[PDB]
Design a binder for these strands. Structure first.
Ligand SMILES: [Mg+2]
Ligand SMILES: [Mg+2]
Ligand SMILES: [Mg+2]
Ligand SMILES: [Mg+2]
Ligand SMILES: [Mg+2]
Ligand SMILES: [Mg+2]
Ligand SMILES: [Mg+2]
Ligand SMILES: [Mg+2]
Ligand SMILES: [Mg+2]
Ligand SMILES: [Mg+2]
Ligand SMILES: [Mg+2]
Ligand SMILES: [Mg+2]
Ligand SMILES: [Mg+2]
Ligand SMILES: [Mg+2]
Ligand SMILES: [Mg+2]
Ligand SMILES: [Mg+2]
Ligand SMILES: [Mg+2]
Ligand SMILES: [Mg+2]
Ligand SMILES: [Mg+2]
Ligand SMILES: [Mg+2]
Ligand SMILES: [Mg+2]
Ligand SMILES: [Mg+2]
Ligand SMILES: [Mg+2]
Ligand SMILES: [Mg+2]
Ligand SMILES: [Mg+2]
Ligand SMILES: [Mg+2]
Ligand SMILES: [Mg+2]
Ligand SMILES: [Mg+2]
Ligand SMILES: [Mg+2]
Ligand SMILES: [Mg+2]
Ligand SMILES: [Mg+2]
Ligand SMILES: [Mg+2]
Ligand SMILES: [Mg+2]
Ligand SMILES: [Mg+2]
Ligand SMILES: [Mg+2]
Ligand SMILES: [Mg+2]
Ligand SMILES: [Mg+2]
Ligand SMILES: [Mg+2]
Ligand SMILES: [Mg+2]
Ligand SMILES: [Mg+2]
Ligand SMILES: [Mg+2]
Ligand SMILES: [Mg+2]
Ligand SMILES: [Mg+2]
Ligand SMILES: [Mg+2]
Ligand SMILES: [Mg+2]
Ligand SMILES: [Mg+2]
Ligand SMILES: [Mg+2]
Ligand SMILES: [Mg+2]
Ligand SMILES: [Mg+2]
Ligand SMILES: [Mg+2]
Ligand SMILES: [Mg+2]
Ligand SMILES: [Mg+2]
Ligand SMILES: [Mg+2]
Ligand SMILES: [Mg+2]
Ligand SMILES: [Mg+2]
Ligand SMILES: [Mg+2]
Ligand SMILES: [Mg+2]
Lengths: 64, 50, 75, 96
RNA sequence: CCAUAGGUUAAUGAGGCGAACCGGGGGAACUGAAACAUCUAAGUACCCCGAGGAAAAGAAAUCAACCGAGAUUCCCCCAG
RNA sequence: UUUUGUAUAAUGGGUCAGCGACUUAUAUUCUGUAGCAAGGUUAACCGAAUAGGGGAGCCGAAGGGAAACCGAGUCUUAACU
RNA sequence: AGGACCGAACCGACUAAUGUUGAAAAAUUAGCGGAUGACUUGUGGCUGGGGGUGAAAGGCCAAUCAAACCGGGAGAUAGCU
RNA sequence: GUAACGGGGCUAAACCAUGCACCGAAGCUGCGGCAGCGACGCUUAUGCGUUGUUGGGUAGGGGAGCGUUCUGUAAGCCUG
RNA sequence: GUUUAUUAAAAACACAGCACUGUGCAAACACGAAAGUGGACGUAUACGGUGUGACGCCUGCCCGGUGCCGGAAGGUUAAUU
RNA sequence: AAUUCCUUGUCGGGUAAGUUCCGACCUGCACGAAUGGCGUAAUGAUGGCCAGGCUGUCUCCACCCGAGACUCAGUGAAAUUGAACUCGCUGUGAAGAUGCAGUGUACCCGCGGCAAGACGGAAAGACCCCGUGAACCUUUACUAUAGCUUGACACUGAACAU
RNA sequence: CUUUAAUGUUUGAUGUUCUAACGUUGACCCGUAAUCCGGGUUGCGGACAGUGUCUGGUGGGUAGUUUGACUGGGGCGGUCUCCUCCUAAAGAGUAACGGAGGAGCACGAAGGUUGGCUAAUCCUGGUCGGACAUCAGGAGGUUAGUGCAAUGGCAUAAGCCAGCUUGACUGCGAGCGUGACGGCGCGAGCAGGUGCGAAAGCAGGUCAUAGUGAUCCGGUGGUUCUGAAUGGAAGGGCCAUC
């Protein structure tokens, strides 16, 4: 039968144009006040999944 | 620890606030500082200390 | 009572003598000004020396204290 | 996704965004497609007849992909600037 | 007291078996979650009632989206 | 066989014969190979039945953005060197 | 008279030896205890599994018991061999 | 049970120095042969008078093959 | 007297006796979704549970804790509204 | 002391000699009053100790009678078993060798016997550990729950008075 | 319309009484030559009791489960994240239940900037004065100081003092560093706006290196991004924060 997408991963990643995966950064949910402005700003844009982890994400997101 | 988290609130009606911390037992007054508000894009007096 | 240690900071020299660096390139990670900043070298808040200009790393001893200075000579 | 019990990446990272229901009823159209309709006119409904856009698409947009080499009338659709000019440069009559 | 329960007889019909399919009444746990309780396994296995050649379902107090479709059932898509 | 390491006094087998373990289905991706090619291909089903029909659909030719939206650009920001 | 005494049948099982692929998946031999009682025995019957029954040892419930047996879930699961 | 050169035995067959010869391996060379990876002139679906190098190997990856039963080729071919 | 049928027969279990407690009968209590049945065709000199365990001398201090019984102005408090 | 670690406690008895036994002492590591305390006649296939008698229990065995063992005939198993042309020593070595090294010894094959070794056979150690194994069991572990109990509503009505 | 006496009258509590529900494992009659059952008559209780739904409590009586790892075996103990030094073999990194110490903060000034200043200790002499307070000189030259461990730094001071202030700014960010990743860190320069300074300039927190916690689920505020017919709203998203 059809592979089941890992639904939790479908909510954290989105496929880019050259097959990569964009994700929101960690450490910006709460406890924001002790964190420097500069650290918070660099965490606001979406980063791309690194090479070591694209296998895990692609495994989890087959129909992406 | 002792020191407690506060929000410094813009007087420009924007809703923009900073966040910082204060010791309440010492210096029990209201922290008032001029800070950049990025809605009206001017430096503005901010007011609160809980 | 004697089983703790800190993770190591990977300090020290990252770009050696004559090494062609781009601007922004960290040159030394250090605790304090073991090396001081010279021409086209900035000293950051953690006292790490970084390049302000593209060019060649140059170590030199200067001044009445014989302090160690780092500069970038534009090639 | 199991990484040995380390908090795996799909849960270590935060959820983001929502899904718009509008995006699913909104289709892009290439200039190459404007010749595939019967009659020169390019409405949302004659694009469905030519299997360019889905049968449940309510909103359609012509973008600058490919080329149009024909006088084409586009009605009730949206048109990019770049696409608007390629249509106008070939006998085009865009009608809101 | 009426009556009613109750009694006797007649006539008609049922009773039990049977593989699966069907509908209904009840309903697990192992297991998986790399432990476990929510969750899963699964309304599965199992027990029970009843039916038929199929059963159930079925002629909109349904969908739709301001255009319209026109009962139910099954198949492929929609779509992991 | 298991091991850092086994003549090992570590494991297994008395012998022969026969049987005895990486399969199958569906999805998905990569490679090879073939077909067609900015187009490729049909599913159920119909049936002139391995034909032909069926293009409903799926993928691809456009992406960016949480989204509206914009679109070879887009997002970000009041605006970007 | 007696949960009285000695002692056979009968019921039991303290010791020792034998045997331990036994004659026997618990016996034999010599001795040992009870032996009118809370005794023993025949026939039939009732109690059913988280249940029974237990003068209580987790004992016994068809040579199986800290949850019987048979069938099914079932190819449970087995990061182990 | 000699049992503290492996033994026999050795006063060198011990030790130190100074040398020249020999033995000594699946190392090197020599002869013959297979294969892999390259690079080369003629010439070409290249293969060679050629040339260079490589070729121990568990887990493990890659490449090419053997044979077995069955289907077609096969109402043919072999076979009392 | 009883017991680990098949390595323990004992100082273990039981025992008469003692006490505490429950129980007024449609008894408590127990088996039972229930009906019912036992208790008992008994009725507090009875029945159930618990502990101790003939007999003899006796069984001392402690109710703070935990339970059990009782008390109740106040406080806290569910569904509901 | 069925309770005492220290402990073979101290003293005494009994014995030539007594970690046991008996008695008393108190220093009760860590008795104690119905999870009873202290006694207690009788009883016990009960535990411990002493003595008389008795004896092959023993000093220390000897002989005898029978059933086996041995021989013949007949029938005819078994566990085990990688293959075996299956010696000692010393050493070496997956660290305790028939199998390696060196050495020594040894003609080939049975039968009766003995069990030192073949880390002999038997049972995928039962101790110890590990597994994000299992089962029962306990509890003021967690979460539930039958049961018990509280109240509200329903079955559930009428009046009188305050 | 402020106020305030009453009852037909609505439902509240309590008390008493009743009977017709309900009960009866009381008597009696019949079904029926039946200690079941039912009906009937009667008495006794009687809106109680009892049962259903809901609800609080109790609840090893029963069930499902949990009860960590490292570890010179395991257990007891100790340890589990972060910072500093040594081990560490002159780049980085580098283990032990190796050796030694700290952290889980503090600060609207202890931050920014301008301007100014330079210690410890001892010596000599001097009212209360001790060996050590304060004053003056001298020698000394950082042997001090750094909000807190240690290390490296620090006089152009980063150390002490004062004035003005909020750059403890917002959006971005060439390029580097360090990490398996998550991430962490350094950062000129740009835009906007600010402070200090005459000006050059400095300022995106503190001499630096510890002072921390992913995701989920929610909360708060902002933002008309989305808004399941449509307009809204709910909720969701996005930004800030808990
Ligand atoms: Mg947020
Ligand atoms: Mg179509
Ligand atoms: Mg389960
Ligand atoms: Mg599990
Ligand atoms: Mg569930
Ligand atoms: Mg091993
Ligand atoms: Mg080993
Ligand atoms: Mg070897
Ligand atoms: Mg051997
Ligand atoms: Mg072994
Ligand atoms: Mg072996
Ligand atoms: Mg074997
Ligand atoms: Mg008798
Ligand atoms: Mg007797
Ligand atoms: Mg007999
Ligand atoms: Mg006999
Ligand atoms: Mg006998
Ligand atoms: Mg007798
Ligand atoms: Mg026991
Ligand atoms: Mg049995
Ligand atoms: Mg079955
Ligand atoms: Mg199996
Ligand atoms: Mg199953
Ligand atoms: Mg000797
Ligand atoms: Mg020589
Ligand atoms: Mg040779
Ligand atoms: Mg060679
Ligand atoms: Mg050759
Ligand atoms: Mg090879
Ligand atoms: Mg070789
Ligand atoms: Mg007796
Ligand atoms: Mg026994
Ligand atoms: Mg016995
Ligand atoms: Mg007792
Ligand atoms: Mg007693
Ligand atoms: Mg009470
Ligand atoms: Mg004696
Ligand atoms: Mg003796
Ligand atoms: Mg006691
Ligand atoms: Mg006695
Ligand atoms: Mg014979
Ligand atoms: Mg055999
Ligand atoms: Mg030899
Ligand atoms: Mg022999
Ligand atoms: Mg053995
Ligand atoms: Mg084992
Ligand atoms: Mg079991
Ligand atoms: Mg339990
Ligand atoms: Mg389970
Ligand atoms: Mg452990
Ligand atoms: Mg180093
Ligand atoms: Mg080094
Ligand atoms: Mg600026
Ligand atoms: Mg500091
Ligand atoms: Mg909102
Ligand atoms: Mg709606
Ligand atoms: Mg709406």
């Amino acid at each position: 039968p059809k592979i089941k997408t890992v639904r939790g991963a479908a909510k954290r990643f989105k496929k880019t144009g050259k097959g990569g995966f964009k994700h929101k950064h960690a450490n910006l949910r709460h406890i924001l006040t002790k964190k420097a402005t500069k650290r918070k700003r660099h965490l606001r844009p979406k980063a791309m999944v690194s090479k070591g982890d694209l296998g895990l994400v692609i495994a989890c997101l087959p129909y992406a | 620890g002792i020191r407690e988290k506060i929000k410094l609130v813009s007087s420009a009606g924007t809703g923009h606030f900073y966040t910082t911390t204060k010791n309440k037992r010492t210096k029990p007054e209201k922290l008032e500082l001029k800070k950049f508000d990025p809605v009206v894009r001017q430096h503005v007096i901010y007011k609160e200390a809980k | 009572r004697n089983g703790r240690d800190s993770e190591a900071k990977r300090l020290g020299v990252k770009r050696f003598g004559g090494e062609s660096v781009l601007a922004g390139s960290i040159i030394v990670r250090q605790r304090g000004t073991k090396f001081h900043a010279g021409a086209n070298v900035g000293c950051g808040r953690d006292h790490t020396l970084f390049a302000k200009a593209d060019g060649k790393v140059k170590f030199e001893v200067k001044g009445p204290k014989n302090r160690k200075f780092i500069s970038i000579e534009a090639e | 996704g199991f990484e040995g019990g380390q908090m795996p990446l799909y849960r270590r990272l935060p959820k983001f965004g929502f899904t718009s229901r509008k995006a699913a009823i909104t289709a892009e159209i290439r200039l190459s497609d404007l010749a595939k309709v019967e009659g020169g006119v390019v409405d949302l409904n004659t694009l469905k007849a030519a299997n360019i856009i889905g049968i449940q698409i309510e909103f359609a947009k012509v973008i600058l992909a490919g080329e149009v080499t024909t006088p084409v009338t586009v009605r009730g659709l949206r048109v990019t600037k770049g696409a608007r000019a390629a249509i106008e440069a070939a006998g085009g009559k865009i009608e809101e």
